[PDB]
Structures are given as structure tokens and as C-alpha cells.
Structure 1
Amino acid sequence: SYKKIRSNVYVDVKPLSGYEATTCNCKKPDDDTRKGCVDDCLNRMIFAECSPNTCPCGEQCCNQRIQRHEWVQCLERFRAEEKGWGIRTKEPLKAGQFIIEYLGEVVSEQEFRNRMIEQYHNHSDHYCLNLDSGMVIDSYRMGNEARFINHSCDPNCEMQKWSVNGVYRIGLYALKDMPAGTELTYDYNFHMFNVEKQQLCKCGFEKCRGIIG
């Protein structure tokens, strides 16, 4: 239970990326149906999204996925085995594919530490990612479906920090091909803000670490 938000809620923090000037030099394809900025793209290489009114490809550019909230419509919440409630795809997914933005409240470290002590006592789950410079996307109360995605020691998805119009935002990308019905997973230890509490890992993998965080 949470409020669904279409976009992040900025509380007491602004996660400015520091860089702004972005022009591709990767060129428009003549076909309307063929995508513009692919793996060559200068901006994509530094994990920055193109700006629509400056990009050499304009509307052909597929390096604006967060900006344009170009999420996938497969995602389905389901009764996960031992893990509670998880999320899978009804449709096959290819590697490198943008899946969903991770949404929530953007809060400072002290604001989150406050919320942890003041409000998130005797809580069995942990809904938040490190963003930047000790800023946190908290999704305990507000967020999207990306909050139901479980941990794996062997993940098929990955949280990527992007500069979008001067602002850092986190997007979920596939690491491998995934067929219909398969649950989405990522490695928490990377992104999850270090909390004193530890949890047994039920990801069910040969070389499972046995612990989360």
C-alpha cells in the first residue's frame, strides 16, 4: 500500500547532475520507423539523455526514455514464493532494454534517517535507493510498481543512474534476454542505502550470498 505517482516528489533536496551541454553528432536515419540515437551516441555513452529540442535526431532519438516515460506495459504484481509480492513480465524482454523508472520521494540522508527512526520502525520491507551525494529515492509511501521488485544474487535487471535534463534519475534496464512469465530482479547491495538490518536471501540461486546487504 502506497500512493501511485507518475513522477518523483522532490522534498528537501535537488539532485543536479552538474553537466548540461549535450549534442550527439550521431545522425538522423531517413526511415521514420528506424530509431535515431543507438549505441554510437555520445550522450548515451556518458549516461546522459538527449534534450528533445537540441538532439540531431529530434523525434527519432530513442535516448529520452526517462523524459518521455516510455515504460513497458507488461509488468504484473504477483504472489512471490517466500519473498512476498513480486513483479514479472507478461512479454519477453531483450538485454539493455529500458523497463521502468524507479519513482519515489527524493529525500536527503538526514530526512531519510529521520523517517527511518520516526516512522519506519517495526517495518519488514525496505523501499529506497541511493541516488547521489547522500540523497535517497524513498518509496516507502509514494512510488510506482518498481517498488515491488525483489533482490537476486543473480539479477536480470540493473538500476542505472542517468542525467536527465541536468537531473539524476534512476532507470531499470535488462541485463539479459527474458522470456514471458519471468520475475524481475536486481542486486540490492549496490543501490540500497546501508541499514543496520540484514535479511535472509530466498532468491534461490546456486551461488546465492544467503544475505541481503
Structure 2
Amino acid sequence: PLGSKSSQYRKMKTEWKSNVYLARSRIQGLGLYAARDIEKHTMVIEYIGTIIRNEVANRKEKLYESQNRGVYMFRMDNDHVIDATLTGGPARYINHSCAPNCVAEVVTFERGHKIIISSSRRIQKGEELCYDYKFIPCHCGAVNCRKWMN
């Protein structure tokens, strides 16, 4: 059952721009930040990109490597991967942290699966958004950091 996920999703799609902004990360490179106060259990932004097959993702990764283009892929399911390297949405910029304030979840609609980034606690304005990548040295800078993203 979808519960309130449909309403939450549509509502989020109309105002995700008011929730986030792009800025240089204290962790690494660019990151996504809270543009305003965000309450617990709030759908913040959708991870958007091009849906590719597994072997395509394997080819693309080696191609995205050898040009030093980092990881902008999010696994949708066992057969498909969302590639946001060349095209997609700003959610690609959300960094990894050992102390995450967001969570990445799959919502199954009829028209397809959606990767949704939701808050796991109240997030104040100016805070950098971050979740657990669940995959390399880690630099999230949090107290009691796991030192590694693996």
C-alpha cells in the first residue's frame, strides 16, 4: 500500500527547490544544503537521472573513470541503475556521511520506481544534507567517523 507516499511525492516535486541549494562541501567538492528548516520524515528531493542496465553501468563507470568523473550512480533495483553523471537532478551532489541527516528510499509507484531522499531528523537551515551511500577514505568530518566509505 502506498499510504501517503503519493501525496508526499507530488508535494515534494513542486517545492524541492525551496528545500535545497548548491554550495561547496565541507566534506568534498560540491554538496547540497538545507535552504530552510526541514522537519523529520520529510521528502526532500528525488534522485533523478537516466535509467540504464547493469552492463551499461559497468561500461559507463570505466568511461566515467579515466576522466576522473566520480560516482553519480544510484542503484534503483537489481537490474537497473540511475545514472546522473551527464544528466539528472541536484540530488547527485548530496554527500556521504557516517552521521547522516537524510535517508535514501525506494518508492514503488505503478509508473515506476522512484529514489526519494527524506530527512531522518529535523534539519536546520545551512546544514549540509547527507545520507549513507551503503557502498575509499571518508571525510564527512563527523564525530566518531568510520574513516572509510566501505
Give the TM-score taking structure 1 as reference length.
0.64
In structure 1, the residue matched to 2:2 is: 43
Paired amino acid for 1:133: N
- The structure showing larger relative contact order (alpha-carbon pairs under 8 Å, at least 6 residues apart) is 2
Is residue 132 from structure 1 mapped to residue 91 from structure 2 by the alignment? no
Q: Tell me the distance in 1 between the aligned counterparts of 2:62 and 2:117.
A: 29
- Cα offset, 1:110, TM superposition: 0.3
1:210 and 1:122, CA in 2 relative to 1: closer, same or farther beyond 3 A? Answer: farther
In structure 1, the residue matched to 2:86 is: 141
What do the CA deviations read for 1:36-59 (whole angstroms, capped 9, x no partner)?
xxxxxx4238xxx55xxxxxxxxx
Find 2:57's aligned residue among 98, 106, 112: 112
Report the identity percentage.
Answer: 23
Alignment partner of 1:173: what SS?
Answer: strand
The root-mean-square deviation of aligned C-alpha atoms, in Å, is: 2.0
More helix by share: 2
Equivalent residues, number: 149
- Structure 2 gaps of 5+ residues are none
1:148 and 1:119, CA in 2 relative to 1: closer, same or farther beyond 3 A? Answer: closer
More strand by share: 2
Q: Tell me the distance in 1 between the aligned counterparts of 2:2 and 2:19.
A: 28
Contact 1:109–1:136 (Cα < 8 Å) also in 2: yes
Structure number with greater Rg is: 1
What do the CA deviations read for 1:157-196 (whole angstroms, capped 9, x no partner)?
011100122411101100000111111000011xx5xxxx
